[PDB]
Amino acid sequence: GMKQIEMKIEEILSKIYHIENEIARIKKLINLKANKADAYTKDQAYTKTEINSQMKQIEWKIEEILSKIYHIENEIARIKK
Amino acid sequence: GMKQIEMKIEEILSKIYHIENEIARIKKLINLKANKADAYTKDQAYTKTEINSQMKQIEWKIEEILSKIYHIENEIARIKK
Amino acid sequence: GMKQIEMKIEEILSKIYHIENEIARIKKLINLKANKADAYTKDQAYTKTEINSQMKQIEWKIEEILSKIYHIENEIARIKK
Known part of the structure:
Protein backbone atom coordinates (compact mmCIF):
# COMPACT_ATOMS: atom_id res chain seq x y z
CA GLY A 1 0.00 0.00 0.00
CA ALA A 34 9.64 40.53 -30.35
CA ASN A 35 7.13 42.62 -28.44
CA LYS A 36 3.86 43.82 -30.00
CA ALA A 37 4.70 47.21 -28.57
CA ASP A 38 7.92 47.38 -30.67
CA ALA A 39 7.37 45.42 -33.87
CA TYR A 40 6.20 47.23 -36.93
CA THR A 41 3.21 45.84 -38.82
CA LYS A 42 1.09 46.94 -41.77
CA ASP A 43 -0.38 49.52 -39.37
CA GLN A 44 2.95 51.30 -38.85
CA ALA A 45 4.95 50.73 -42.04
CA TYR A 46 4.87 50.29 -45.79
CA THR A 47 6.00 47.13 -47.50
CA LYS A 48 8.76 46.97 -50.12
CA THR A 49 6.10 46.69 -52.81
CA GLU A 50 4.31 49.81 -51.50
CA ILE A 51 7.56 51.83 -51.36
CA ASN A 52 8.56 50.59 -54.82
CA SER A 53 5.23 51.79 -56.24
CA GLN A 54 5.68 55.26 -54.70
CA MET A 55 9.29 55.49 -55.89
CA LYS A 56 8.26 54.38 -59.38
CA GLN A 57 5.79 57.25 -59.65
CA ILE A 58 8.60 59.69 -58.76
CA GLU A 59 11.06 58.11 -61.10
CA TRP A 60 8.68 58.35 -64.11
CA LYS A 61 8.23 62.03 -63.35
CA ILE A 62 11.98 62.54 -63.15
CA GLU A 63 12.55 60.78 -66.46
CA GLU A 64 9.76 62.84 -68.12
CA ILE A 65 11.42 66.00 -66.78
CA LEU A 66 14.82 64.99 -68.07
CA SER A 67 13.26 64.33 -71.46
CA LYS A 68 11.70 67.82 -71.47
CA ILE A 69 14.98 69.40 -70.55
CA TYR A 70 16.86 67.53 -73.28
CA HIS A 71 14.33 68.86 -75.80
CA ILE A 72 14.67 72.39 -74.41
CA GLU A 73 18.48 72.24 -74.74
CA ASN A 74 18.14 71.14 -78.34
CA GLU A 75 15.71 74.02 -78.96
CA ILE A 76 18.17 76.47 -77.51
CA ALA A 77 20.97 75.03 -79.64
CA ARG A 78 18.78 75.62 -82.76
CA ILE A 79 18.00 79.20 -81.73
CA LYS A 80 21.62 80.07 -81.15
CA LYS A 81 22.68 78.42 -84.51
CA GLY B 1 -5.97 7.56 5.64
CA ALA B 34 8.19 36.70 -34.33
CA ASN B 35 11.85 36.69 -33.21
CA LYS B 36 13.46 39.87 -31.95
CA ALA B 37 16.32 39.09 -34.33
CA ASP B 38 13.95 39.36 -37.34
CA ALA B 39 11.28 41.89 -36.49
CA TYR B 40 11.69 45.46 -37.64
CA THR B 41 11.10 48.22 -35.08
CA LYS B 42 11.66 51.95 -35.01
CA ASP B 43 15.38 51.18 -34.90
CA GLN B 44 15.33 49.50 -38.28
CA ALA B 45 12.53 51.07 -40.30
CA TYR B 46 10.56 54.22 -41.04
CA THR B 47 6.87 54.52 -40.26
CA LYS B 48 4.29 55.37 -42.91
CA THR B 49 4.17 58.91 -41.43
CA GLU B 50 7.96 59.27 -41.84
CA ILE B 51 7.86 58.03 -45.40
CA ASN B 52 4.86 60.19 -46.29
CA SER B 53 6.69 63.30 -45.01
CA GLN B 54 9.71 62.53 -47.17
CA MET B 55 7.61 61.74 -50.27
CA LYS B 56 5.55 64.93 -49.85
CA GLN B 57 8.76 66.98 -49.83
CA ILE B 58 9.91 65.30 -53.00
CA GLU B 59 6.53 65.92 -54.66
CA TRP B 60 6.81 69.62 -53.71
CA LYS B 61 10.22 69.85 -55.39
CA ILE B 62 8.85 68.10 -58.47
CA GLU B 63 5.90 70.49 -58.59
CA GLU B 64 8.34 73.45 -58.44
CA ILE B 65 10.40 71.94 -61.27
CA LEU B 66 7.37 71.32 -63.48
CA SER B 67 6.32 74.98 -63.06
CA LYS B 68 9.79 76.11 -64.06
CA ILE B 69 9.85 73.80 -67.11
CA TYR B 70 6.42 74.94 -68.33
CA HIS B 71 7.56 78.54 -67.99
CA ILE B 72 10.73 77.83 -69.97
CA GLU B 73 8.87 76.07 -72.76
CA ASN B 74 6.57 79.09 -73.08
CA GLU B 75 9.58 81.46 -73.13
CA ILE B 76 11.16 79.44 -75.91
CA ALA B 77 7.91 79.43 -77.85
CA ARG B 78 7.87 83.22 -77.69
CA ILE B 79 11.48 83.55 -78.90
CA LYS B 80 10.77 81.34 -81.87
CA LYS B 81 7.66 83.35 -82.84
CA GLY C 1 5.21 6.64 7.56
CA ALA C 34 4.15 39.92 -31.87
CA ASN C 35 2.94 37.24 -34.30
CA LYS C 36 4.97 36.12 -37.23
CA ALA C 37 1.82 36.66 -39.29
CA ASP C 38 1.89 40.43 -38.41
CA ALA C 39 5.50 41.49 -37.86
CA TYR C 40 7.41 43.08 -40.69
CA THR C 41 10.91 41.75 -41.35
CA LYS C 42 13.42 42.06 -44.13
CA ASP C 43 11.02 39.95 -46.26
CA GLN C 44 8.31 42.59 -46.08
CA ALA C 45 9.96 46.01 -45.57
CA TYR C 46 12.94 48.19 -46.30
CA THR C 47 15.26 49.41 -43.60
CA LYS C 48 15.98 53.10 -42.90
CA THR C 49 19.32 52.65 -44.65
CA GLU C 50 17.71 51.14 -47.75
CA ILE C 51 15.09 53.94 -47.91
CA ASN C 52 17.89 56.57 -47.37
CA SER C 53 19.77 55.22 -50.34
CA GLN C 54 16.76 55.29 -52.58
CA MET C 55 15.90 58.83 -51.43
CA LYS C 56 19.52 59.97 -52.00
CA GLN C 57 19.33 58.72 -55.60
CA ILE C 58 16.17 60.77 -56.18
CA GLU C 59 17.74 63.83 -54.53
CA TRP C 60 20.76 63.62 -56.89
CA LYS C 61 18.42 63.67 -59.86
CA ILE C 62 16.49 66.59 -58.46
CA GLU C 63 19.78 68.44 -57.93
CA GLU C 64 20.85 67.71 -61.51
CA ILE C 65 17.53 69.01 -62.80
CA LEU C 66 17.62 72.21 -60.66
CA SER C 67 21.11 72.91 -61.98
CA LYS C 68 20.04 72.39 -65.57
CA ILE C 69 17.03 74.69 -65.12
CA TYR C 70 19.15 77.47 -63.57
CA HIS C 71 21.60 77.19 -66.47
CA ILE C 72 18.83 77.29 -69.07
CA GLU C 73 17.17 80.35 -67.46
CA ASN C 74 20.51 82.18 -67.55
CA GLU C 75 21.00 81.20 -71.18
CA ILE C 76 17.50 82.44 -72.10
CA ALA C 77 17.99 85.76 -70.20
CA ARG C 78 21.15 86.32 -72.30
CA ILE C 79 19.43 85.46 -75.60
CA LYS C 80 16.63 87.95 -74.88
CA LYS C 81 18.93 90.83 -73.67
Missing part, protein backbone atom coordinates in the same frame (compact mmCIF):
# COMPACT_ATOMS: atom_id res chain seq x y z
CA MET A 2 2.73 2.37 1.05
CA LYS A 3 4.97 0.96 -1.67
CA GLN A 4 2.39 1.75 -4.37
CA ILE A 5 1.96 5.28 -3.07
CA GLU A 6 5.71 5.79 -3.00
CA MET A 7 6.03 4.67 -6.60
CA LYS A 8 3.33 7.05 -7.70
CA ILE A 9 5.07 9.84 -5.80
CA GLU A 10 8.36 9.06 -7.57
CA GLU A 11 6.66 9.30 -10.97
CA ILE A 12 4.92 12.56 -9.95
CA LEU A 13 8.21 14.14 -8.86
CA SER A 14 9.83 13.15 -12.17
CA LYS A 15 6.95 14.74 -14.13
CA ILE A 16 7.21 17.93 -12.01
CA TYR A 17 10.96 18.19 -12.52
CA HIS A 18 10.43 17.80 -16.24
CA ILE A 19 7.75 20.54 -16.23
CA GLU A 20 10.06 22.88 -14.32
CA ASN A 21 12.74 22.37 -16.95
CA GLU A 22 10.25 22.94 -19.76
CA ILE A 23 9.16 26.20 -18.11
CA ALA A 24 12.79 27.33 -17.77
CA ARG A 25 13.28 26.70 -21.50
CA ILE A 26 10.02 28.48 -22.34
CA LYS A 27 11.06 31.59 -20.43
CA LYS A 28 14.30 31.69 -22.40
CA LEU A 29 12.42 31.31 -25.72
CA ILE A 30 9.94 34.05 -24.81
CA ASN A 31 12.84 36.43 -24.25
CA LEU A 32 13.88 35.86 -27.89
CA LYS A 33 10.50 37.06 -29.18
CA MET B 2 -4.60 5.64 2.68
CA LYS B 3 -7.83 6.31 0.79
CA GLN B 4 -7.38 10.05 1.34
CA ILE B 5 -3.79 9.94 0.15
CA GLU B 6 -4.84 8.04 -2.94
CA MET B 7 -7.48 10.67 -3.69
CA LYS B 8 -4.89 13.43 -3.39
CA ILE B 9 -2.61 11.54 -5.70
CA GLU B 10 -5.46 11.27 -8.27
CA GLU B 11 -5.99 15.02 -8.07
CA ILE B 12 -2.29 15.65 -8.50
CA LEU B 13 -2.06 13.43 -11.51
CA SER B 14 -5.04 15.19 -13.11
CA LYS B 15 -3.47 18.58 -12.43
CA ILE B 16 -0.21 17.44 -13.95
CA TYR B 17 -1.89 16.18 -17.08
CA HIS B 18 -3.73 19.49 -17.43
CA ILE B 19 -0.51 21.43 -16.96
CA GLU B 20 1.28 19.29 -19.52
CA ASN B 21 -1.46 20.03 -22.06
CA GLU B 22 -1.15 23.73 -21.34
CA ILE B 23 2.57 23.62 -21.84
CA ALA B 24 2.17 21.82 -25.13
CA ARG B 25 -0.22 24.55 -26.31
CA ILE B 26 2.16 27.25 -25.05
CA LYS B 27 5.05 25.82 -27.04
CA LYS B 28 3.01 25.88 -30.26
CA LEU B 29 1.92 29.49 -29.60
CA ILE B 30 5.47 30.61 -28.96
CA ASN B 31 6.51 29.20 -32.28
CA LEU B 32 3.99 31.54 -33.96
CA LYS B 33 5.69 34.58 -32.46
CA MET C 2 1.82 8.01 6.54
CA LYS C 3 2.83 11.35 8.07
CA GLN C 4 5.92 11.53 5.89
CA ILE C 5 3.89 10.70 2.76
CA GLU C 6 1.42 13.43 3.67
CA MET C 7 4.34 15.90 3.93
CA LYS C 8 5.69 14.89 0.48
CA ILE C 9 2.19 15.37 -0.90
CA GLU C 10 2.14 18.87 0.68
CA GLU C 11 5.46 19.73 -0.98
CA ILE C 12 4.14 18.47 -4.33
CA LEU C 13 0.96 20.55 -4.02
CA SER C 14 3.15 23.60 -3.24
CA LYS C 15 5.26 22.96 -6.32
CA ILE C 16 2.18 22.62 -8.46
CA TYR C 17 0.70 25.88 -7.19
CA HIS C 18 3.95 27.63 -7.99
CA ILE C 19 3.99 26.11 -11.45
CA GLU C 20 0.42 27.21 -12.12
CA ASN C 21 1.40 30.75 -11.27
CA GLU C 22 4.42 30.54 -13.60
CA ILE C 23 2.17 29.32 -16.41
CA ALA C 24 -0.28 32.16 -15.84
CA ARG C 25 2.63 34.60 -16.12
CA ILE C 26 3.93 32.91 -19.22
CA LYS C 27 0.58 33.20 -20.93
CA LYS C 28 0.49 36.93 -20.19
CA LEU C 29 4.01 37.32 -21.65
CA ILE C 30 3.18 35.43 -24.77
CA ASN C 31 0.19 37.70 -25.40
CA LEU C 32 2.60 40.70 -25.41
CA LYS C 33 4.61 39.11 -28.22
Whole structure:
Protein backbone atom coordinates (compact mmCIF):
# COMPACT_ATOMS: atom_id res chain seq x y z
CA GLY A 1 0.00 0.00 0.00
CA MET A 2 2.73 2.37 1.05
CA LYS A 3 4.97 0.96 -1.67
CA GLN A 4 2.39 1.75 -4.37
CA ILE A 5 1.96 5.28 -3.07
CA GLU A 6 5.71 5.79 -3.00
CA MET A 7 6.03 4.67 -6.60
CA LYS A 8 3.33 7.05 -7.70
CA ILE A 9 5.07 9.84 -5.80
CA GLU A 10 8.36 9.06 -7.57
CA GLU A 11 6.66 9.30 -10.97
CA ILE A 12 4.92 12.56 -9.95
CA LEU A 13 8.21 14.14 -8.86
CA SER A 14 9.83 13.15 -12.17
CA LYS A 15 6.95 14.74 -14.13
CA ILE A 16 7.21 17.93 -12.01
CA TYR A 17 10.96 18.19 -12.52
CA HIS A 18 10.43 17.80 -16.24
CA ILE A 19 7.75 20.54 -16.23
CA GLU A 20 10.06 22.88 -14.32
CA ASN A 21 12.74 22.37 -16.95
CA GLU A 22 10.25 22.94 -19.76
CA ILE A 23 9.16 26.20 -18.11
CA ALA A 24 12.79 27.33 -17.77
CA ARG A 25 13.28 26.70 -21.50
CA ILE A 26 10.02 28.48 -22.34
CA LYS A 27 11.06 31.59 -20.43
CA LYS A 28 14.30 31.69 -22.40
CA LEU A 29 12.42 31.31 -25.72
CA ILE A 30 9.94 34.05 -24.81
CA ASN A 31 12.84 36.43 -24.25
CA LEU A 32 13.88 35.86 -27.89
CA LYS A 33 10.50 37.06 -29.18
CA ALA A 34 9.64 40.53 -30.35
CA ASN A 35 7.13 42.62 -28.44
CA LYS A 36 3.86 43.82 -30.00
CA ALA A 37 4.70 47.21 -28.57
CA ASP A 38 7.92 47.38 -30.67
CA ALA A 39 7.37 45.42 -33.87
CA TYR A 40 6.20 47.23 -36.93
CA THR A 41 3.21 45.84 -38.82
CA LYS A 42 1.09 46.94 -41.77
CA ASP A 43 -0.38 49.52 -39.37
CA GLN A 44 2.95 51.30 -38.85
CA ALA A 45 4.95 50.73 -42.04
CA TYR A 46 4.87 50.29 -45.79
CA THR A 47 6.00 47.13 -47.50
CA LYS A 48 8.76 46.97 -50.12
CA THR A 49 6.10 46.69 -52.81
CA GLU A 50 4.31 49.81 -51.50
CA ILE A 51 7.56 51.83 -51.36
CA ASN A 52 8.56 50.59 -54.82
CA SER A 53 5.23 51.79 -56.24
CA GLN A 54 5.68 55.26 -54.70
CA MET A 55 9.29 55.49 -55.89
CA LYS A 56 8.26 54.38 -59.38
CA GLN A 57 5.79 57.25 -59.65
CA ILE A 58 8.60 59.69 -58.76
CA GLU A 59 11.06 58.11 -61.10
CA TRP A 60 8.68 58.35 -64.11
CA LYS A 61 8.23 62.03 -63.35
CA ILE A 62 11.98 62.54 -63.15
CA GLU A 63 12.55 60.78 -66.46
CA GLU A 64 9.76 62.84 -68.12
CA ILE A 65 11.42 66.00 -66.78
CA LEU A 66 14.82 64.99 -68.07
CA SER A 67 13.26 64.33 -71.46
CA LYS A 68 11.70 67.82 -71.47
CA ILE A 69 14.98 69.40 -70.55
CA TYR A 70 16.86 67.53 -73.28
CA HIS A 71 14.33 68.86 -75.80
CA ILE A 72 14.67 72.39 -74.41
CA GLU A 73 18.48 72.24 -74.74
CA ASN A 74 18.14 71.14 -78.34
CA GLU A 75 15.71 74.02 -78.96
CA ILE A 76 18.17 76.47 -77.51
CA ALA A 77 20.97 75.03 -79.64
CA ARG A 78 18.78 75.62 -82.76
CA ILE A 79 18.00 79.20 -81.73
CA LYS A 80 21.62 80.07 -81.15
CA LYS A 81 22.68 78.42 -84.51
CA GLY B 1 -5.97 7.56 5.64
CA MET B 2 -4.60 5.64 2.68
CA LYS B 3 -7.83 6.31 0.79
CA GLN B 4 -7.38 10.05 1.34
CA ILE B 5 -3.79 9.94 0.15
CA GLU B 6 -4.84 8.04 -2.94
CA MET B 7 -7.48 10.67 -3.69
CA LYS B 8 -4.89 13.43 -3.39
CA ILE B 9 -2.61 11.54 -5.70
CA GLU B 10 -5.46 11.27 -8.27
CA GLU B 11 -5.99 15.02 -8.07
CA ILE B 12 -2.29 15.65 -8.50
CA LEU B 13 -2.06 13.43 -11.51
CA SER B 14 -5.04 15.19 -13.11
CA LYS B 15 -3.47 18.58 -12.43
CA ILE B 16 -0.21 17.44 -13.95
CA TYR B 17 -1.89 16.18 -17.08
CA HIS B 18 -3.73 19.49 -17.43
CA ILE B 19 -0.51 21.43 -16.96
CA GLU B 20 1.28 19.29 -19.52
CA ASN B 21 -1.46 20.03 -22.06
CA GLU B 22 -1.15 23.73 -21.34
CA ILE B 23 2.57 23.62 -21.84
CA ALA B 24 2.17 21.82 -25.13
CA ARG B 25 -0.22 24.55 -26.31
CA ILE B 26 2.16 27.25 -25.05
CA LYS B 27 5.05 25.82 -27.04
CA LYS B 28 3.01 25.88 -30.26
CA LEU B 29 1.92 29.49 -29.60
CA ILE B 30 5.47 30.61 -28.96
CA ASN B 31 6.51 29.20 -32.28
CA LEU B 32 3.99 31.54 -33.96
CA LYS B 33 5.69 34.58 -32.46
CA ALA B 34 8.19 36.70 -34.33
CA ASN B 35 11.85 36.69 -33.21
CA LYS B 36 13.46 39.87 -31.95
CA ALA B 37 16.32 39.09 -34.33
CA ASP B 38 13.95 39.36 -37.34
CA ALA B 39 11.28 41.89 -36.49
CA TYR B 40 11.69 45.46 -37.64
CA THR B 41 11.10 48.22 -35.08
CA LYS B 42 11.66 51.95 -35.01
CA ASP B 43 15.38 51.18 -34.90
CA GLN B 44 15.33 49.50 -38.28
CA ALA B 45 12.53 51.07 -40.30
CA TYR B 46 10.56 54.22 -41.04
CA THR B 47 6.87 54.52 -40.26
CA LYS B 48 4.29 55.37 -42.91
CA THR B 49 4.17 58.91 -41.43
CA GLU B 50 7.96 59.27 -41.84
CA ILE B 51 7.86 58.03 -45.40
CA ASN B 52 4.86 60.19 -46.29
CA SER B 53 6.69 63.30 -45.01
CA GLN B 54 9.71 62.53 -47.17
CA MET B 55 7.61 61.74 -50.27
CA LYS B 56 5.55 64.93 -49.85
CA GLN B 57 8.76 66.98 -49.83
CA ILE B 58 9.91 65.30 -53.00
CA GLU B 59 6.53 65.92 -54.66
CA TRP B 60 6.81 69.62 -53.71
CA LYS B 61 10.22 69.85 -55.39
CA ILE B 62 8.85 68.10 -58.47
CA GLU B 63 5.90 70.49 -58.59
CA GLU B 64 8.34 73.45 -58.44
CA ILE B 65 10.40 71.94 -61.27
CA LEU B 66 7.37 71.32 -63.48
CA SER B 67 6.32 74.98 -63.06
CA LYS B 68 9.79 76.11 -64.06
CA ILE B 69 9.85 73.80 -67.11
CA TYR B 70 6.42 74.94 -68.33
CA HIS B 71 7.56 78.54 -67.99
CA ILE B 72 10.73 77.83 -69.97
CA GLU B 73 8.87 76.07 -72.76
CA ASN B 74 6.57 79.09 -73.08
CA GLU B 75 9.58 81.46 -73.13
CA ILE B 76 11.16 79.44 -75.91
CA ALA B 77 7.91 79.43 -77.85
CA ARG B 78 7.87 83.22 -77.69
CA ILE B 79 11.48 83.55 -78.90
CA LYS B 80 10.77 81.34 -81.87
CA LYS B 81 7.66 83.35 -82.84
CA GLY C 1 5.21 6.64 7.56
CA MET C 2 1.82 8.01 6.54
CA LYS C 3 2.83 11.35 8.07
CA GLN C 4 5.92 11.53 5.89
CA ILE C 5 3.89 10.70 2.76
CA GLU C 6 1.42 13.43 3.67
CA MET C 7 4.34 15.90 3.93
CA LYS C 8 5.69 14.89 0.48
CA ILE C 9 2.19 15.37 -0.90
CA GLU C 10 2.14 18.87 0.68
CA GLU C 11 5.46 19.73 -0.98
CA ILE C 12 4.14 18.47 -4.33
CA LEU C 13 0.96 20.55 -4.02
CA SER C 14 3.15 23.60 -3.24
CA LYS C 15 5.26 22.96 -6.32
CA ILE C 16 2.18 22.62 -8.46
CA TYR C 17 0.70 25.88 -7.19
CA HIS C 18 3.95 27.63 -7.99
CA ILE C 19 3.99 26.11 -11.45
CA GLU C 20 0.42 27.21 -12.12
CA ASN C 21 1.40 30.75 -11.27
CA GLU C 22 4.42 30.54 -13.60
CA ILE C 23 2.17 29.32 -16.41
CA ALA C 24 -0.28 32.16 -15.84
CA ARG C 25 2.63 34.60 -16.12
CA ILE C 26 3.93 32.91 -19.22
CA LYS C 27 0.58 33.20 -20.93
CA LYS C 28 0.49 36.93 -20.19
CA LEU C 29 4.01 37.32 -21.65
CA ILE C 30 3.18 35.43 -24.77
CA ASN C 31 0.19 37.70 -25.40
CA LEU C 32 2.60 40.70 -25.41
CA LYS C 33 4.61 39.11 -28.22
CA ALA C 34 4.15 39.92 -31.87
CA ASN C 35 2.94 37.24 -34.30
CA LYS C 36 4.97 36.12 -37.23
CA ALA C 37 1.82 36.66 -39.29
CA ASP C 38 1.89 40.43 -38.41
CA ALA C 39 5.50 41.49 -37.86
CA TYR C 40 7.41 43.08 -40.69
CA THR C 41 10.91 41.75 -41.35
CA LYS C 42 13.42 42.06 -44.13
CA ASP C 43 11.02 39.95 -46.26
CA GLN C 44 8.31 42.59 -46.08
CA ALA C 45 9.96 46.01 -45.57
CA TYR C 46 12.94 48.19 -46.30
CA THR C 47 15.26 49.41 -43.60
CA LYS C 48 15.98 53.10 -42.90
CA THR C 49 19.32 52.65 -44.65
CA GLU C 50 17.71 51.14 -47.75
CA ILE C 51 15.09 53.94 -47.91
CA ASN C 52 17.89 56.57 -47.37
CA SER C 53 19.77 55.22 -50.34
CA GLN C 54 16.76 55.29 -52.58
CA MET C 55 15.90 58.83 -51.43
CA LYS C 56 19.52 59.97 -52.00
CA GLN C 57 19.33 58.72 -55.60
CA ILE C 58 16.17 60.77 -56.18
CA GLU C 59 17.74 63.83 -54.53
CA TRP C 60 20.76 63.62 -56.89
CA LYS C 61 18.42 63.67 -59.86
CA ILE C 62 16.49 66.59 -58.46
CA GLU C 63 19.78 68.44 -57.93
CA GLU C 64 20.85 67.71 -61.51
CA ILE C 65 17.53 69.01 -62.80
CA LEU C 66 17.62 72.21 -60.66
CA SER C 67 21.11 72.91 -61.98
CA LYS C 68 20.04 72.39 -65.57
CA ILE C 69 17.03 74.69 -65.12
CA TYR C 70 19.15 77.47 -63.57
CA HIS C 71 21.60 77.19 -66.47
CA ILE C 72 18.83 77.29 -69.07
CA GLU C 73 17.17 80.35 -67.46
CA ASN C 74 20.51 82.18 -67.55
CA GLU C 75 21.00 81.20 -71.18
CA ILE C 76 17.50 82.44 -72.10
CA ALA C 77 17.99 85.76 -70.20
CA ARG C 78 21.15 86.32 -72.30
CA ILE C 79 19.43 85.46 -75.60
CA LYS C 80 16.63 87.95 -74.88
CA LYS C 81 18.93 90.83 -73.67
